[PDB]
């Protein structure tokens, strides 16, 4: 009965071939999906397309529109007309 117990213990050891194959397939599919995702992540250029339209990059326009009435940068005719009216 010692050999029978040893065989049962060895069978309790090892791994289920069905579970091993399923895990292998799942792991390979996951790696393939993630690697194509990382390749498309790397494919993007460093300079974005819309960077010239971004609000953060176009920060001078708002400030200068706010500050356009300061005497240091006024159009002379604007000052003339505001004096006239």
């Amino acid at each position: 009965f010692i050999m029978e117990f040893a065989e049962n213990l060895v069978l309790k050891l090892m791994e289920d071939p069905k579970e091993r194959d399923r895990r292998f397939r799942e792991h390979v599919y996951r790696v393939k999906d993630r690697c194509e995702k990382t390749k498309e992540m790397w494919s993007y250029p460093m300079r974005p397309y819309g960077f010239w339209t971004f609000e953060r990059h176009n920060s001078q326009l708002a400030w200068d529109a706010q500050i356009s009435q300061v005497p240091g940068r006024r159009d002379p005719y604007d000052d003339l007309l505001q004096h006239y009216s």
Binding site: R23, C35, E36
Partner: protein
């Protein structure tokens, strides 16, 4: 019973030794030996649960190293790496057992370095990720260099360590370039995807060239073998055992795993190149082993010749050739370890390596003479030994592939039966030189026990190689069948 547990066993013992005072040398030795033996038994339990039927990697474990870029840590075995894992795990406790007598002078750093090396070896052989495999591949460089430099016999240890480090670093660096190129091309470093993805013929040629350079630094070929004899000569006996039976086998493992199946067309294109390199290396290295004066140099050049036989046996892309290559890898690890242990015993007794001083050791060391004769026979590849099994299977594959290179490799039989016999006769046979050596002692209990597993392993793998052969036929068949679909 998992590979992560196998990797973590040396770590716990290493930490325990790090946090123990150096004055408790008995405790340090006992704990290191216990950790090594526990890891060996754990690896054996992993052996009694290995499935030789499937071709998939058996105990696949996934850990999150980098969630992006697909460099997650994958731990797995398939049948080829497995016997190397067992070999390293078995050979580590032998290294601690060797320095048992004078371990206080060595200190706990010796055992800590060897345990860290064991950790690195298990990590290398249990890996399904190319980048992490390279990481540990080059990690093994630290402990061996430190061992050679710190515990070398004489001042040439500095030059030997420098040569070893520089050669291995250059090879590893070119391999790193190739691996990063593969990563950028494929999007992942996973072994399964790298095997199932194509490469351009020019890209295959360049990547294979880089990998071949990296691995040929490890496995000694014609131009890059000169660093190995000096490294063995200047390293301690345990360091020589490790460097002979572990690191070269690492190199040939990496080559066989990542070069042959990944780049089939490149391997076919470069197959005559490695055949001629291996034949030239075998003949030249055996002939230069014949005219040598240092024991460590003799066994180191024998290592070079047999490793070149291994690499001549892999591109014989058939079951016989590849199985013989793997079997002779294991057998040569055992035989090199045993021969370097014998030379280390001789050096520890009488602090010299030249064979001019030695002679007539039958009358004073009969057990050592018997052990040395058996292991010189194993190096010679006498029938009924594991080295013979590997060599004959390699020659069968080489004759099925290319008769000329098979004959050139078989010419190594005559030369290997020459220097082995002549060295054994010089050292053991003859009359005592009482003027040079006049006090002698035979092998003691510790050394005799150390030699016991080597004899049993060699005899079992030679007389009945069925277990080792059947544990890898599936992987060998799948590896040869990888390129084709017919």
């Amino acid at each position: 019973f998992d590979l992560s547990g196998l990797i973590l066993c040396p770590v716990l013992g290493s930490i325990i030794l790090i946090f123990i005072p150096n004055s408790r040398i008995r405790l340090i030795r006992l704990i290191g030996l216990c950790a090594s033996l526990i890891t060996f038994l754990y690896s054996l339990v992993l052996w009694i649960q290995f499935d030789p039927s499937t071709a998939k990697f058996q105990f696949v474990e996934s850990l999150r190293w980098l969630p992006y870029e697909n460099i997650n840590l994958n731990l797995g075995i398939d049948g080829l790496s497995f016997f190397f894992v067992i070999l390293t795990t078995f050979l580590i406790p032998i290294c601690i057992l060797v320095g048992w007598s004078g371990m206080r002078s060595y200190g706990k750093e010796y055992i800590i370095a060897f345990l860290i090396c064991e950790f690195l070896m298990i990590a290398v052989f249990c890996m399904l990720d190319l980048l992490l495999f390279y990481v540990f591949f080059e990690s093994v460089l630290i402990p061996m260099f430190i061992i050679i430099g710190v515990w070398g016999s004489r001042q040439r240890k500095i030059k030997a360590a420098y040569q070893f480090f520089l050669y291995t670093l250059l090879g590893s660096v070119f391999m790193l370039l190739a691996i990063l190129l593969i990563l950028f091309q494929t999007g992942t470093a996973d072994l399964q995807i790298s095997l199932t993805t194509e490469f351009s013929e020019r890209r295959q040629i360049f990547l294979w060239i880089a990998f071949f350079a990296a691995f040929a630094v490890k496995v000694p070929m014609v131009p890059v073998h000169i660093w190995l004899p000096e490294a063995h000569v200047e390293a301690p006996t345990a360091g020589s055992v490790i460097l002979a039976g572990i690191l070269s086998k690492l190199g040939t493992y990496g080559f066989l795993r990542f070069s042959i199946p990944m780049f089939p067309e490149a391997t076919l294109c470069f197959t005559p190149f490695i055949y001629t390199l291996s034949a030239i290396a075998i003949i030249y290295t055996s002939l230069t082993t014949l005219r040598q004066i240092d024991l460590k140099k003799i066994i180191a050049y024998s290592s070079v010749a047999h490793m070149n036989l291994v690499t001549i046996g892999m591109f014989s892309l058939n079951i016989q050739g590849i199985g013989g290559s793997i079997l002779l890898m294991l057998s040569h690890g055992l035989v090199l370890s045993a021969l370097f242990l014998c030379v280390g015993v001789l050096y520890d007794r009488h602090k010299t390596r030249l064979v001019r001083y030695y002679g007539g050791l039958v009358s004073t060391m009969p057990n050592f003479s018997t052990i040395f004769f058996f292991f010189t026979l194993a190096n010679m590849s006498l029938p009924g030994t594991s080295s013979f099994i590997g060599e004959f299977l390699i020659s069968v594959g080489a004759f099925q592939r290319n008769s000329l290179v098979a004959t050139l490799a078989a010419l190594g039989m005559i030369l290997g039966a020459a220097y082995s016999l002549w060295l054994y006769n010089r050292v053991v046979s003859g009359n005592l030189k009482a003027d040079f050596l006049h006090k002698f002692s035979d092998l003691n209990g510790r050394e005799v026990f150390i030699f016991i597993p080597f004899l049993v392993g060699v005899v079992r793998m030679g007389v009945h190689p069925k277990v080792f052969l059947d544990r890898m036929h599936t992987y060998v068949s799948n590896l040869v069948q990888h390129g084709k679909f017919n």
